[PDB]
Amino acid sequence: KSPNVLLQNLCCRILGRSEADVAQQFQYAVRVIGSNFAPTVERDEFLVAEKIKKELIRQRREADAALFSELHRKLHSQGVLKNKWSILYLLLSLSEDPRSYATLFAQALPRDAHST
Amino acid sequence: AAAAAANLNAVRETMDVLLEISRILNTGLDMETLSICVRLCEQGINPEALSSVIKELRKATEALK
Amino acid sequence: PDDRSWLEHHVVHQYWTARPSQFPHSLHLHSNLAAVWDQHLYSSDPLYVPDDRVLVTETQVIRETLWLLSGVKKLFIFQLIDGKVTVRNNIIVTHLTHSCLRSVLEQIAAYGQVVFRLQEFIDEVMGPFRTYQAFMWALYKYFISFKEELAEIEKCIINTTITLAIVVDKLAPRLSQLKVLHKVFSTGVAETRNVVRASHLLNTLYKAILEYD
Amino acid sequence: MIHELLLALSGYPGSIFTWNKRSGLQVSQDFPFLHPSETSVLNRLCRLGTDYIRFTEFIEQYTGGLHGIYLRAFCTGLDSVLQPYRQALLDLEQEFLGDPHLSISHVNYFLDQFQLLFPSVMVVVEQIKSQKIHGCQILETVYKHSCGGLPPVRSALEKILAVCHGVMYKQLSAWMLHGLLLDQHEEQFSLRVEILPSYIPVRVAEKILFVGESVQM
Amino acid sequence: ITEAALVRDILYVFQGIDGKNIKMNNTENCYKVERSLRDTAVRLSELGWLHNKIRRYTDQRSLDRSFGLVGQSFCAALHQELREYYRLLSVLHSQLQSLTLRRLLVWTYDPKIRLKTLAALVDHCQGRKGGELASAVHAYTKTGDPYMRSLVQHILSLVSH
Amino acid sequence: LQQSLELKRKMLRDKQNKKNSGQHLPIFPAWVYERPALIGDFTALPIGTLPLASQESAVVEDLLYVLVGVDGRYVSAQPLAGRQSRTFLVDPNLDLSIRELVHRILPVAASYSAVTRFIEEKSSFEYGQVNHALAAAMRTLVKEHLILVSQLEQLHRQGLLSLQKLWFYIQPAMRTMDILASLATSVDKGECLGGSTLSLLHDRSFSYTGDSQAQELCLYLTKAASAPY
Amino acid sequence: LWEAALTYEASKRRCWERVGCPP
């Protein structure tokens, strides 16, 4: 869609309240997502797969860590998506326990060795 | 055509896979909202911005609970 | 055109009359196995005169079988040899290697002969004894309930997916019950007086119940 | 290919795999586009289907020597252990319908619990074939192996034993209520002591005999 | 020689089934090749080297009945662990149709420990049954690594049942 | 080398003599020790006559092989493997400028071999559950090292890595590995076990109490090693 | 557009002659 109204679609998804019932949260989101919408980082679904494994190992379900490995195979079998990194990194960002340190764990390049 | 309807078939499969990935990691978002998040991730987007918004709109109904 | 094309669309009648059918599909080995096996043979140098197979699809072959199995006779596939159904050798779908095929259709054809012979027993009654009529009436009361399920399956071929491995397991509680009739009737078809011809028939049944009491 | 197996595992020999009494279902067919190590995988897989064919022969002939209704209780229990092997043939097809490709290793993997089940029931069937049971002595040679050491074949034979007790409760229902003889022809008059199970104590079997005999008088 | 053949060969020697240009020549030394990539092969082929030993012993004692209910109980646990090792491999096969993740070193690293420990456990219970065997696996549950404590504890839950 | 087996046998005698109801201590089978593929670290045309920016690609590739403990193409790993000593020899077809920087990259590989030897030797059943758990927690850091090098492999495959990027990339992990190898040498030198390898860790926790690169390692390893005690 | 279309029903007619979700 067009990215400006597509945010309001999310805002009306979570709370069903109208876009005339609140206008500050919506303004706060046009504040936050714009100038942080286009990546300034280098993409890697590899590295994110290798921490999705590390998340599901941390929940100590090893078969489901192998179930994601098959679902990730299916994702490449179709080939209908271009940016396969983003959504998985998103779903990884929203991770939660159904039932430390991270700066010594791999993160991507912030473009401090590559600039155009 | 038919091969243009088979692309939409390979999207409807792919979304079922994305929903399974969503449930084995446990989000509080369902399929209807998740599809909008998939729309957003198609244009390319950073979740350091998006996760704050989701944990805020779920915090904007604790005083309207 | 204009009639032949519209037939070709709606009616199925072309894999056994002029222009034998060609089935395009998903190719690559998982259901393209017949073509791989043919190419393997052709590489292996027979060398010439390829095996005549006319290429019928599978779901159809299921329909033709269920018609044969229900108890109506005279279908083009599965020729007689003395009144005995035997497998026809032009059948191939896109896999099934043509040898396991020729065994599995033979097995089901062996079960079809069992019901064929009973319908033959009955068909010579329509072109007295009064025990033979009661016999036939019992067979028919069984037969119609058997035929009803098969007839239902035939609609559901158009519907889901239906294959050989499903219909074999589904017909397991019937193909159990046919095997006993093949043994009971085999002494009821083997013999002059109407009093020994009645006693010998009643006695088979009276023995068969006490057999598994 | 993935219905070729689903008949090769079933009771149909095919041109690819050659069944033999020397060594059954040996893959002798080679393709240039196969890795040469797939044949060893195929041997490990063909172990399954060879066992199934063997079982099917033995069921087919049945249902002093080997006679009686007792083997027609054993074969019926052997139907029951094979029953979830037919359902587990259907599940493979159901997976195959959607997935674009699958590898042989997953099927090999999933049906590993019947690489325990099948040879350890093969021992039981061969022991019952080489010897002759005409008494109630099927219960011994199943109960010899019901102690077991491998957990799937421990419950498999439990199926068969429950079936054979179901056959025994026809003999011991006509006997104990009607006092009838010829509930089955073997091979006053009482049960032959030689063919009686020893894990049934002999005193209890005598008590059974007295209860049956009283109805005659 | 191209990489794609090498990937295929190494993909089979995890099972303990030979490749095409990697074959098992000696059965006490590792698989020997029929240049840096060739050096990578020797550390991955030890997994199948251990597999063949442990699989050869647990194949034969499982169909042994003068080895006792205990010991067949050991073999059942071992065999269940062999299963979880094939479950990972099936995915790796299907994921072709590069696919080298340091030639899968990070993947193979976690079963690598799981092979050493089971190869240790089969020799300590050599020719044993009953409480004598069960003591010899209770010898290994005096350990501090949680992964090893779990790997022993799972088997031990079965063997003393 | 051969020196490990000595100490192991003496400690085996000590624990066999001390407990008299404790029968049958386990050790690892013989092939665990004899085979050289249970550790992680142990013709071609001259590159010099080529253009420079292809030589750089080749030395990137070879160096990258060496970091994880496998030989490159114009670099040989020296067949010493002595005490904690380990050197590597780059072949003389390379200009000096690249050579010095490559030498500067080499200490993290020796500081990888020092850790790797430790994790095997101090996980035997003579050093007890605290050395077990400690080597098992350094194993986690070995795995995360592998995690990093795997992603950089993919980046070089797409033609987007060079020596100056790589030198910069590996700087924060270099410190971590140096601290870990020094800790390994320290525990081995005193042959610490029991609570003496909880006093040394107590000391090192004060010793590096800055940077958050090194203080979190010590704090994690201390909590990890002290649980069986 | 795509997820707007995506609220449709897909085919349940399947065949054994194709394995890539036969329509």
Side-chain angles (χ1 to χ4, degrees), chain B residues 3-28:
Chain B
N7 295 2
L8 197 50
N9 190 9
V11 181
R12 180 62 208 187
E13 201 288 325
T14 299
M15 184 45 228
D16 203 13
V17 187
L18 312 173
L19 192 48
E20 184 64 38
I21 296 297
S22 77
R23 67 185 305 274
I24 62 170
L25 66 84
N26 183 230
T27 328

Side-chain angles (χ1 to χ4, degrees), chain D residues 22-214:
Chain D
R22 310 195 71 200
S23 61
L25 315 183
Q26 295 317 105
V27 59
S28 45
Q29 300 330 110
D30 308 305
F31 299 115
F33 57 91
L34 293 191
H35 203 274
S37 46
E38 182 65 28
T39 50
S40 87
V41 173
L42 280 160
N43 299 144
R44 170 163 171 167
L45 266 309
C46 85
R47 297 169 189 166
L48 289 86
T50 41
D51 291 0
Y52 189 81
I53 293 166
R54 202 62 78 183
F55 293 145
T56 302
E57 301 156 58
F58 191 33
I59 296 167
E60 166 63 22
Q61 63 166 33
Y62 290 118
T63 50
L66 283 161
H67 292 298
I69 199 57
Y70 306 89
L71 322 171
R72 304 170 163 178
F74 193 91
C75 277
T76 65
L78 174 61
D79 302 350
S80 62
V81 291
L82 291 172
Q83 147 67 32
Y85 185 59
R86 308 183 173 99
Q87 184 52 64
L89 195 67
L90 175 80
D91 304 305
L92 315 173
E93 318 165 54
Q94 298 177 77
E95 310 141 5
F96 291 158
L97 286 170
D99 299 332
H101 298 280
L102 304 90
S103 55
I104 305 300
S105 62
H106 172 265
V107 189
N108 203 5
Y109 173 56
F110 176 51
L111 294 92
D112 205 4
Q113 295 297 300
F114 298 99
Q115 305 331 285
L116 175 156
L117 253 173
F118 291 173
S120 52
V121 56
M122 191 66 70
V123 290
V124 178
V125 309
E126 292 274 71
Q127 298 156 309
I128 295 167
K129 285 153 87 178
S130 57
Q131 305 201 111
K132 314 291 178 71
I133 307 293
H134 51 81
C136 319
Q137 293 287 275
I138 54 166
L139 288 94
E140 306 307 301
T141 174
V142 295
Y143 186 71
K144 173 191 177 51
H145 300 289
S146 58
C147 297
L150 318 176
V153 71
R154 290 182 153 176
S155 62
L157 276 64
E158 183 168 18
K159 304 201 206 179
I160 300 169
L161 70 80
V163 176
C164 86
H165 301 152
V167 172
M168 203 188 52
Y169 298 155
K170 309 194 281 181
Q171 300 177 66
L172 304 183
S173 308
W175 171 268
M176 310 187 331
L177 279 308
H178 310 148
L180 281 203
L181 188 44
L182 292 179
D183 301 334
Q184 59 95 24
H185 75 279
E186 194 175 75
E187 306 184 285
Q188 308 309 119
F189 288 129
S190 50
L191 188 74
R192 165 162 51 158
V193 56
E194 292 189 289
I195 52 106
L196 167 80
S198 86
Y199 71 85
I200 301 181
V202 308
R203 38 156 196 180
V204 192
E206 182 272 300
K207 300 167 184 185
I208 298 173
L209 294 193
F210 165 77
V211 183
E213 292 296 327
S214 316

Side-chain angles (χ1 to χ4, degrees), chain E residues 28-30 35-37 39-40 42-43 46 49-50 101-102 106 109-110 112 116 119-120 123-124 128 139-140 142-145, chain F residues 24 26 29 31 34-35 37-44 64-65 68-73 129 132 136 139 142-143 149-150 153:
Chain E
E28 174 269 313
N29 291 317
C30 200
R35 31 179 279 175
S36 281
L37 324 166
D39 315 325
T40 314
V42 301
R43 284 185 182 88
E46 71 93 34
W49 192 98
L50 293 162
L101 291 90
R102 290 271 147 169
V106 47
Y109 189 88
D110 311 328
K112 191 171 159 58
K116 321 161 190 213
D123 291 338
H124 197 224
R128 308 188 186 202
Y140 287 75
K142 310 173 179 64
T143 183
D145 179 9
Chain F
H24 286 50
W31 43 93
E34 71 209 37
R35 299 307 301 158
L38 201 35
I39 61 174
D41 40 72
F42 178 54
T43 315
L64 186 48
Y65 282 132
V68 309
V70 69
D71 304 329
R73 176 176 56 251
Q129 309 183 189
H132 294 181
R139 177 272 323 151
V142 170
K143 202 54 176 278
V149 305
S150 43
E153 189 175 17

Side-chain angles (χ1 to χ4, degrees), chain F residues 16 100 106 161 208 216:
Chain F
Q16 182 63 33
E100 310 325 296
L106 297 189
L161 263 183
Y208 303 115
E216 291 287 312

